[PDB]
Design a protein around this ligand. Structure first.
Ligand SMILES: *[C@@](O)(C(=O)NC1CC1)[C@H](C[C@@H]1CCCNC1=O)NC(=O)[C@H](CC1CCCCC1)NC(=O)c1cc2ccccc2o1
Ligand SMILES: [Ca+2]
Ligand SMILES: [Ca+2]
Length: 327
């Protein structure tokens, strides 16, 4: 019920100590040094680390905020790191309000009570643990190098990504991964995998129920070989790339009931251009209320597809349920 302290570090104790001492926390466990960034691609002498510096948000802007207009999936915009699986897990997590509020302790701020330390809860090896970080973040050309919010002064997702790097020993360790790991590390649940070509006839209903329960869902397109990793298709889907599944709804359309599914590219941009895409003409033949409820004309990485097209274009689905045997 109460989280174990990762590496014995006590968030409240350290915060109060720094606050009374008039100093900012510096994390001995995960210091702002090259090793923290990485070892090969992000290694000490890699050109990928050119110009990277470590700065706290308070050393960057005037009024840095932890959470702005809520901690939501639009705050998850991938940086220069191969951790799409993890960022898709975070975006999916934001749809489960209870779990989101466990992983991200709200009420942390850069104002009252600030001592340069933040904390997060992660499910690790069968137990919840509390991971602290200092708020030094990798910056290049004045901007965050890795994950960032669409809101430039919002830092909760950057700090959560840093905490996850910390438990993995470096940012580079997060490059290339499996969405199921992030889902489970944020929920304590277990993921079931679906091969779309061989799915049960009621997969759409399974997806609806799972989204309703607050389960976490993701999807992806298989790669044919190494060199079509991250290939962008003609209709602007990305292969070998973790997407969050963020919604589903049936609408009346041309005399039939059509099932739609909504998903989000953790890039926060580059979307499907086919039927039910933000600017597609299908929305012209949908009820004006349902159109207003579902359709958002915004280059934000999130878009709708018909379930038929979803089944045609994507290859895999993952569903991470918290209590799969007790619904
Ligand atoms: C994401 O698409 C991503 O982060 N994209 C932004 C960088 C542009 C990554 C890209 C991947 C990262 C490593 C370097 N080159 C790449 O193409 N894609 C993955 O991480 C991919 C996601 C999974 C999610 C669920 C099934 C589909 C694929 N996973 C891997 O590439 C991967 C996973 C894994 C597990 C163990 C060992 C290696 C390994 O690689
Ligand atoms: Ca926000
Ligand atoms: Ca969109």
């Amino acid at each position: 019920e109460n989280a174990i302290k990762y590496l014995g570090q006590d968030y409240e104790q350290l915060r109060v100590r720094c606050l009374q001492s008039g100093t900012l926390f510096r994390d001995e466990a995960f210091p702002p040094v090259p090793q923290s960034l990485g070892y090969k691609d992000l290694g000490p002498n890699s050109s990928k680390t050119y110009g990277i510096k470590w700065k706290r948000p308070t050393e960057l802007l005037s009024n840095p905020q932890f959470i702005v207009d809520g901690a939501t999936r639009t705050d998850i915009c991938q940086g220069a790191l191969g951790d799409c699986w993890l960022l898709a897990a975070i975006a999916s997590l934001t749809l489960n309000d209870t779990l989101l509020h466990r992983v991200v302790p709200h009420g942390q701020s850069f104002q009252n009570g600030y001592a340069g330390i933040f904390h997060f809860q992660l499910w690790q090896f069968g137990e919840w643990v509390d991971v602290v970080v200092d708020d030094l973040l990798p910056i290049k050309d004045g901007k965050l190098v890795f994950v960032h919010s669409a809101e430039g002064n919002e830092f909760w997702s950057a700090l959560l990504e840093k905490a996850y790097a910390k438990v993995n020993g470096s940012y580079e360790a997060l490059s290339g991964g499996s969405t199921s790991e992030g889902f489970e590390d944020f929920t304590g649940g277990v993921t079931e995998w679906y091969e779309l070509r061989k799915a049960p006839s009621d997969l759409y209903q399974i997806i609806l129920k799972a989204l309703e329960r607050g389960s976490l869902l993701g999807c992806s397109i298989d790669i044919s070989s190494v060199l079509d990793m991250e290939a962008i298709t003609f209709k602007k889907l990305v292969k070998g790339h973790a997407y969050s599944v963020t919604g589903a709804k049936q609408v009346n359309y041309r005399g039939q009931v059509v099932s739609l599914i909504r998903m989000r590219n953790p890039w926060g941009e580059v979307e499907w251009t086919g039927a039910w895409s933000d600017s597609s003409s299908e929305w012209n033949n949908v009820d004006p209320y349902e159109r207003d409820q579902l359709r958002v004309k915004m280059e934000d990485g999130e878009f709708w597809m018909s379930f038929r097209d979803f089944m045609r274009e994507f290859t895999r689905l993952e569903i991470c349920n918290l209590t799969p045997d007790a619904l």
